[PDB]
Enzyme design. Structure first.
Site, PDB file in Angstrom:
ATOM      1  N   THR A  16      19.308  25.718  34.539  1.00 45.23           N
ATOM      2  CA  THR A  16      18.853  25.590  33.157  1.00 45.23           C
ATOM      3  C   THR A  16      19.984  25.240  32.197  1.00 45.23           C
ATOM      4  O   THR A  16      19.762  25.220  30.981  1.00 45.23           O
ATOM      5  CB  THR A  16      18.153  26.865  32.680  1.00 45.23           C
ATOM      6  N   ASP A  39      13.522  -1.077  48.256  1.00 46.97           N
ATOM      7  CA  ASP A  39      14.827  -1.431  47.710  1.00 46.97           C
ATOM      8  C   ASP A  39      15.498  -2.484  48.590  1.00 46.97           C
ATOM      9  O   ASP A  39      14.813  -3.363  49.130  1.00 46.97           O
ATOM     10  CB  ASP A  39      15.665  -0.146  47.603  1.00 46.97           C
ATOM     11  N   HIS A  69      22.733  -0.596  47.589  1.00 49.66           N
ATOM     12  CA  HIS A  69      21.918   0.064  46.568  1.00 49.66           C
ATOM     13  C   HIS A  69      20.817   0.912  47.197  1.00 49.66           C
ATOM     14  O   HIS A  69      20.615   2.079  46.823  1.00 49.66           O
ATOM     15  CB  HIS A  69      21.346  -1.026  45.661  1.00 49.66           C
ATOM     16  N   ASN A 161      17.645  -0.268  32.552  1.00 56.04           N
ATOM     17  CA  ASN A 161      19.007  -0.041  32.066  1.00 56.04           C
ATOM     18  C   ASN A 161      19.362  -0.936  30.883  1.00 56.04           C
ATOM     19  O   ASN A 161      20.493  -1.405  30.767  1.00 56.04           O
ATOM     20  CB  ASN A 161      20.041  -0.268  33.169  1.00 56.04           C
ATOM     21  N   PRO A 175       1.456   2.995  33.071  1.00 59.77           N
ATOM     22  CA  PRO A 175       1.296   4.389  32.630  1.00 59.77           C
ATOM     23  C   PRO A 175       0.927   5.362  33.730  1.00 59.77           C
ATOM     24  O   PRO A 175       1.155   6.554  33.551  1.00 59.77           O
ATOM     25  CB  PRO A 175       0.199   4.312  31.557  1.00 59.77           C
ATOM     26  N   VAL A 177       2.155   5.752  36.827  1.00 61.51           N
ATOM     27  CA  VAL A 177       3.236   6.157  37.717  1.00 61.51           C
ATOM     28  C   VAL A 177       4.262   6.945  36.908  1.00 61.51           C
ATOM     29  O   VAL A 177       4.184   7.026  35.686  1.00 61.51           O
ATOM     30  CB  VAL A 177       3.864   4.963  38.459  1.00 61.51           C
ATOM     31  N   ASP A 200       8.248   9.469  31.462  1.00 61.21           N
ATOM     32  CA  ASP A 200       7.700  10.769  31.832  1.00 61.21           C
ATOM     33  C   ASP A 200       8.744  11.864  31.935  1.00 61.21           C
ATOM     34  O   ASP A 200       8.416  13.036  31.716  1.00 61.21           O
ATOM     35  CB  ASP A 200       7.007  10.670  33.191  1.00 61.21           C
ATOM     36  N   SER A 224      18.268   3.596  38.334  1.00 62.43           N
ATOM     37  CA  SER A 224      18.055   3.542  39.778  1.00 62.43           C
ATOM     38  C   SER A 224      18.525   4.804  40.471  1.00 62.43           C
ATOM     39  O   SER A 224      18.049   5.112  41.569  1.00 62.43           O
ATOM     40  CB  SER A 224      18.851   2.396  40.395  1.00 62.43           C
ATOM     41  N   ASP A 260      16.704  19.866  26.088  1.00 69.96           N
ATOM     42  CA  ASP A 260      18.120  20.044  26.377  1.00 69.96           C
ATOM     43  C   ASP A 260      18.931  18.769  26.247  1.00 69.96           C
ATOM     44  O   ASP A 260      20.166  18.841  26.209  1.00 69.96           O
ATOM     45  CB  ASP A 260      18.301  20.554  27.803  1.00 69.96           C
TER      46      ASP A 260
END
Length: 279
Positions: A16, A39, A69, A161, A175, A177, A200, A224, A260
Protein backbone atom coordinates in the site's frame (compact mmCIF):
# COMPACT_ATOMS: atom_id res chain seq x y z
CA UNK A 1 5.35 -16.40 -0.11
CA UNK A 2 7.88 -13.58 -0.24
CA UNK A 3 10.53 -12.62 -2.79
CA UNK A 4 13.18 -10.42 -1.22
CA UNK A 5 14.90 -7.70 -3.27
CA UNK A 6 12.27 -8.01 -5.96
CA UNK A 7 11.96 -5.66 -8.94
CA UNK A 8 10.28 -2.50 -7.69
CA UNK A 9 7.10 -3.11 -9.67
CA UNK A 10 6.50 -6.50 -8.08
CA UNK A 11 7.06 -5.02 -4.63
CA UNK A 12 4.70 -2.17 -5.52
CA UNK A 13 1.80 -4.41 -6.48
CA UNK A 14 1.96 -6.13 -3.06
CA UNK A 15 2.22 -2.92 -1.01
CA UNK A 16 0.00 0.00 0.00
CA UNK A 17 3.05 2.30 -0.14
CA UNK A 18 5.85 3.01 -2.61
CA UNK A 19 9.47 2.26 -1.80
CA UNK A 20 9.33 -1.32 -0.53
CA UNK A 21 11.50 -4.17 -1.76
CA UNK A 22 9.71 -7.48 -1.03
CA UNK A 23 7.06 -9.00 -3.31
CA UNK A 24 4.48 -10.79 -1.15
CA UNK A 25 2.19 -13.22 -2.95
CA UNK A 26 0.19 -16.39 -2.39
CA UNK A 27 2.23 -19.49 -3.26
CA UNK A 28 -0.42 -20.68 -5.73
CA UNK A 29 1.23 -18.07 -7.99
CA UNK A 30 -1.19 -18.38 -10.92
CA UNK A 31 -0.86 -22.17 -11.19
CA UNK A 32 -3.57 -23.52 -13.49
CA UNK A 33 -4.10 -20.25 -15.36
CA UNK A 34 -2.78 -19.48 -18.84
CA UNK A 35 -1.58 -16.17 -20.28
CA UNK A 36 -1.20 -15.55 -24.00
CA UNK A 37 1.46 -12.93 -24.75
CA UNK A 38 0.58 -11.41 -28.13
CA UNK A 39 3.79 -9.68 -29.16
CA UNK A 40 7.19 -10.33 -30.84
CA UNK A 41 7.36 -13.90 -29.51
CA UNK A 42 8.81 -15.46 -26.36
CA UNK A 43 12.26 -17.00 -25.94
CA UNK A 44 10.74 -20.03 -24.25
CA UNK A 45 14.16 -21.59 -23.58
CA UNK A 46 15.03 -18.78 -21.16
CA UNK A 47 15.82 -20.48 -17.82
CA UNK A 48 13.56 -17.95 -16.07
CA UNK A 49 10.49 -19.58 -17.67
CA UNK A 50 11.29 -23.01 -16.17
CA UNK A 51 9.62 -24.87 -19.03
CA UNK A 52 6.31 -23.03 -18.56
CA UNK A 53 6.51 -20.99 -21.78
CA UNK A 54 5.92 -22.11 -25.35
CA UNK A 55 5.27 -20.54 -28.72
CA UNK A 56 1.90 -21.51 -30.18
CA UNK A 57 1.57 -19.31 -33.29
CA UNK A 58 3.67 -17.06 -35.50
CA UNK A 59 2.68 -14.80 -38.38
CA UNK A 60 6.27 -14.52 -39.63
CA UNK A 61 8.98 -16.76 -41.01
CA UNK A 62 10.05 -17.96 -37.57
CA UNK A 63 8.54 -18.22 -34.11
CA UNK A 64 11.76 -16.86 -32.59
CA UNK A 65 11.64 -13.57 -30.68
CA UNK A 66 14.31 -11.68 -32.60
CA UNK A 67 13.48 -8.45 -30.76
CA UNK A 68 13.19 -9.03 -26.99
CA UNK A 69 10.01 -7.05 -26.29
CA UNK A 70 7.73 -10.08 -26.14
CA UNK A 71 10.18 -12.00 -23.96
CA UNK A 72 10.36 -9.03 -21.59
CA UNK A 73 6.57 -8.78 -21.31
CA UNK A 74 6.22 -12.54 -20.82
CA UNK A 75 8.83 -12.33 -18.06
CA UNK A 76 6.77 -9.72 -16.22
CA UNK A 77 3.70 -11.95 -16.49
CA UNK A 78 5.29 -15.15 -15.32
CA UNK A 79 9.05 -15.56 -15.11
CA UNK A 80 10.42 -16.91 -11.83
CA UNK A 81 12.33 -13.79 -10.79
CA UNK A 82 10.55 -11.03 -12.71
CA UNK A 83 6.97 -12.32 -12.91
CA UNK A 84 3.74 -11.52 -11.08
CA UNK A 85 2.26 -15.02 -11.57
CA UNK A 86 5.31 -17.23 -11.17
CA UNK A 87 3.55 -20.55 -11.91
CA UNK A 88 1.27 -19.60 -14.82
CA UNK A 89 1.56 -21.16 -18.28
CA UNK A 90 2.76 -18.75 -20.99
CA UNK A 91 1.74 -19.03 -24.65
CA UNK A 92 3.47 -16.88 -27.26
CA UNK A 93 1.67 -15.48 -30.31
CA UNK A 94 4.07 -13.61 -32.62
CA UNK A 95 2.07 -10.85 -34.31
CA UNK A 96 4.95 -8.33 -34.30
CA UNK A 97 8.07 -8.61 -36.44
CA UNK A 98 11.60 -8.49 -35.08
CA UNK A 99 11.61 -4.68 -35.27
CA UNK A 100 8.56 -4.61 -32.98
CA UNK A 101 6.10 -3.58 -35.72
CA UNK A 102 3.05 -5.29 -37.13
CA UNK A 103 0.11 -4.75 -39.44
CA UNK A 104 -3.33 -4.37 -37.90
CA UNK A 105 -4.67 -7.29 -39.96
CA UNK A 106 -2.02 -9.56 -38.40
CA UNK A 107 -2.68 -8.31 -34.87
CA UNK A 108 -6.40 -8.94 -35.42
CA UNK A 109 -5.70 -12.46 -36.69
CA UNK A 110 -3.61 -13.16 -33.58
CA UNK A 111 -6.46 -12.12 -31.30
CA UNK A 112 -8.91 -14.35 -33.17
CA UNK A 113 -6.37 -17.17 -32.95
CA UNK A 114 -6.26 -16.94 -29.15
CA UNK A 115 -10.06 -16.94 -28.89
CA UNK A 116 -10.12 -20.30 -30.66
CA UNK A 117 -6.85 -21.88 -29.46
CA UNK A 118 -7.81 -21.52 -25.79
CA UNK A 119 -10.53 -24.11 -26.40
CA UNK A 120 -7.72 -26.64 -27.09
CA UNK A 121 -5.71 -26.02 -23.89
CA UNK A 122 -6.14 -27.15 -20.28
CA UNK A 123 -6.38 -23.87 -18.33
CA UNK A 124 -8.63 -24.76 -15.40
CA UNK A 125 -8.26 -21.41 -13.62
CA UNK A 126 -8.90 -19.36 -16.77
CA UNK A 127 -7.26 -17.54 -19.64
CA UNK A 128 -5.66 -14.08 -19.93
CA UNK A 129 -4.22 -12.25 -22.94
CA UNK A 130 -1.61 -9.50 -22.64
CA UNK A 131 -1.40 -7.04 -25.56
CA UNK A 132 1.57 -4.68 -25.19
CA UNK A 133 0.99 -3.06 -28.55
CA UNK A 134 -1.08 -0.46 -30.30
CA UNK A 135 -1.37 2.25 -32.87
CA UNK A 136 -3.91 4.81 -33.98
CA UNK A 137 -7.64 4.35 -33.60
CA UNK A 138 -9.12 1.46 -35.58
CA UNK A 139 -12.64 0.14 -35.04
CA UNK A 140 -11.52 -3.21 -36.47
CA UNK A 141 -8.71 -3.59 -33.94
CA UNK A 142 -11.05 -2.57 -31.12
CA UNK A 143 -13.65 -5.07 -32.31
CA UNK A 144 -11.07 -7.87 -32.36
CA UNK A 145 -10.13 -7.08 -28.76
CA UNK A 146 -13.82 -6.99 -27.79
CA UNK A 147 -14.33 -10.40 -29.44
CA UNK A 148 -11.39 -11.89 -27.56
CA UNK A 149 -12.78 -10.62 -24.25
CA UNK A 150 -16.29 -11.83 -25.14
CA UNK A 151 -14.92 -15.31 -25.88
CA UNK A 152 -13.94 -15.64 -22.20
CA UNK A 153 -10.36 -14.27 -22.10
CA UNK A 154 -9.27 -11.51 -19.72
CA UNK A 155 -7.79 -8.99 -22.18
CA UNK A 156 -5.27 -6.45 -20.87
CA UNK A 157 -3.98 -3.83 -23.32
CA UNK A 158 -1.44 -1.02 -23.15
CA UNK A 159 -2.80 2.52 -22.96
CA UNK A 160 0.02 3.78 -25.23
CA UNK A 161 3.12 5.95 -24.76
CA UNK A 162 2.05 9.26 -26.35
CA UNK A 163 1.34 11.30 -23.17
CA UNK A 164 -2.09 11.79 -24.73
CA UNK A 165 -5.70 10.70 -24.42
CA UNK A 166 -5.94 6.95 -25.08
CA UNK A 167 -9.28 7.48 -26.86
CA UNK A 168 -7.27 7.98 -30.07
CA UNK A 169 -5.37 4.67 -29.90
CA UNK A 170 -6.26 1.01 -30.41
CA UNK A 171 -6.85 -1.41 -28.84
CA UNK A 172 -6.45 1.01 -25.88
CA UNK A 173 -9.74 2.74 -26.63
CA UNK A 174 -11.85 -0.45 -26.70
CA UNK A 175 -14.11 -0.01 -23.64
CA UNK A 176 -14.72 -3.70 -22.90
CA UNK A 177 -11.04 -4.66 -22.33
CA UNK A 178 -8.72 -3.61 -19.50
CA UNK A 179 -6.69 -0.57 -20.58
CA UNK A 180 -3.50 -0.16 -18.56
CA UNK A 181 -1.50 3.02 -17.93
CA UNK A 182 2.04 3.22 -16.53
CA UNK A 183 3.43 4.54 -13.24
CA UNK A 184 6.95 5.05 -11.88
CA UNK A 185 8.58 4.00 -8.62
CA UNK A 186 7.65 7.33 -6.96
CA UNK A 187 3.94 6.81 -7.74
CA UNK A 188 3.85 9.36 -10.56
CA UNK A 189 2.09 8.67 -13.81
CA UNK A 190 4.92 7.72 -16.13
CA UNK A 191 5.80 10.79 -18.18
CA UNK A 192 4.95 8.99 -21.46
CA UNK A 193 1.77 7.23 -20.27
CA UNK A 194 -1.47 7.94 -22.05
CA UNK A 195 -4.45 8.84 -19.86
CA UNK A 196 -8.15 9.56 -20.17
CA UNK A 197 -11.59 8.17 -19.42
CA UNK A 198 -10.84 4.85 -21.14
CA UNK A 199 -8.08 3.87 -18.70
CA UNK A 200 -9.07 1.19 -16.19
CA UNK A 201 -5.94 0.85 -14.06
CA UNK A 202 -2.27 1.77 -13.74
CA UNK A 203 0.62 -0.60 -13.25
CA UNK A 204 4.39 -0.22 -12.88
CA UNK A 205 5.85 0.82 -16.22
CA UNK A 206 9.02 2.91 -15.74
CA UNK A 207 12.35 1.07 -15.37
CA UNK A 208 11.00 -2.50 -15.29
CA UNK A 209 13.57 -5.31 -15.09
CA UNK A 210 12.59 -8.52 -16.89
CA UNK A 211 13.81 -11.28 -19.18
CA UNK A 212 15.36 -10.56 -22.58
CA UNK A 213 16.51 -12.63 -25.53
CA UNK A 214 19.81 -14.46 -25.43
CA UNK A 215 19.01 -15.65 -21.91
CA UNK A 216 19.62 -12.13 -20.61
CA UNK A 217 17.76 -9.46 -18.65
CA UNK A 218 17.26 -5.73 -18.98
CA UNK A 219 15.22 -2.79 -17.74
CA UNK A 220 12.94 -0.91 -20.14
CA UNK A 221 9.96 1.46 -19.82
CA UNK A 222 6.50 1.73 -21.33
CA UNK A 223 2.84 0.99 -20.96
CA UNK A 224 3.96 -2.28 -22.58
CA UNK A 225 5.61 -3.04 -19.23
CA UNK A 226 2.61 -2.03 -17.12
CA UNK A 227 0.20 -4.23 -19.11
CA UNK A 228 1.81 -7.61 -18.18
CA UNK A 229 1.79 -6.64 -14.50
CA UNK A 230 -2.00 -6.42 -14.77
CA UNK A 231 -2.28 -9.55 -16.93
CA UNK A 232 -0.18 -11.48 -14.41
CA UNK A 233 -2.21 -10.08 -11.53
CA UNK A 234 -5.42 -11.21 -13.21
CA UNK A 235 -4.02 -14.73 -13.67
CA UNK A 236 -2.94 -14.80 -10.02
CA UNK A 237 -6.37 -13.65 -8.80
CA UNK A 238 -8.22 -16.08 -11.08
CA UNK A 239 -6.15 -18.97 -9.69
CA UNK A 240 -7.16 -17.84 -6.19
CA UNK A 241 -10.82 -17.89 -7.23
CA UNK A 242 -11.31 -14.21 -6.43
CA UNK A 243 -12.48 -13.30 -9.91
CA UNK A 244 -13.14 -14.55 -13.45
CA UNK A 245 -11.96 -13.48 -16.90
CA UNK A 246 -15.15 -11.45 -17.40
CA UNK A 247 -14.88 -9.57 -14.10
CA UNK A 248 -11.12 -9.40 -13.44
CA UNK A 249 -10.56 -5.84 -14.68
CA UNK A 250 -13.38 -4.51 -12.50
CA UNK A 251 -12.18 -6.61 -9.54
CA UNK A 252 -8.66 -5.21 -9.96
CA UNK A 253 -10.11 -1.70 -10.07
CA UNK A 254 -12.32 -2.45 -7.02
CA UNK A 255 -9.31 -3.59 -5.00
CA UNK A 256 -6.66 -1.18 -6.33
CA UNK A 257 -4.72 1.34 -4.29
CA UNK A 258 -6.86 4.45 -4.80
CA UNK A 259 -5.63 8.03 -4.98
CA UNK A 260 -1.92 7.29 -4.53
CA UNK A 261 -0.66 8.40 -7.93
CA UNK A 262 0.38 11.93 -8.84
CA UNK A 263 0.13 13.73 -12.17
CA UNK A 264 -3.19 12.04 -13.00
CA UNK A 265 -5.38 14.44 -15.02
CA UNK A 266 -8.92 15.03 -13.82
CA UNK A 267 -11.19 12.38 -15.33
CA UNK A 268 -8.56 9.63 -15.37
CA UNK A 269 -8.81 6.89 -12.75
CA UNK A 270 -6.33 7.13 -9.89
CA UNK A 271 -6.02 3.38 -9.35
CA UNK A 272 -2.84 1.32 -9.01
CA UNK A 273 -2.94 -2.47 -9.32
CA UNK A 274 -2.66 -4.17 -5.92
CA UNK A 275 -2.86 -7.84 -4.92
CA UNK A 276 -4.25 -7.26 -1.39
CA UNK A 277 -2.13 -10.14 -0.15
CA UNK A 278 -2.35 -10.75 3.59
CA UNK A 279 0.24 -13.06 5.18
Amino acid sequence: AAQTNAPWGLARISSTSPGTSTYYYDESAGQGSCVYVIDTGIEASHPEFEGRAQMVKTYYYSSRDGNGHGTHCAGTVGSRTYGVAKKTQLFGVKVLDDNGSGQYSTIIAGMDFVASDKNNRNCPKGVVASLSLGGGYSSSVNSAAARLQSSGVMVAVAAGNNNADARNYSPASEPSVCTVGASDRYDRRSSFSNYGSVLDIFGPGTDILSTWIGGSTRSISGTSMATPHVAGLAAYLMTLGKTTAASACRYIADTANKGDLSNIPFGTVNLLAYNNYQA
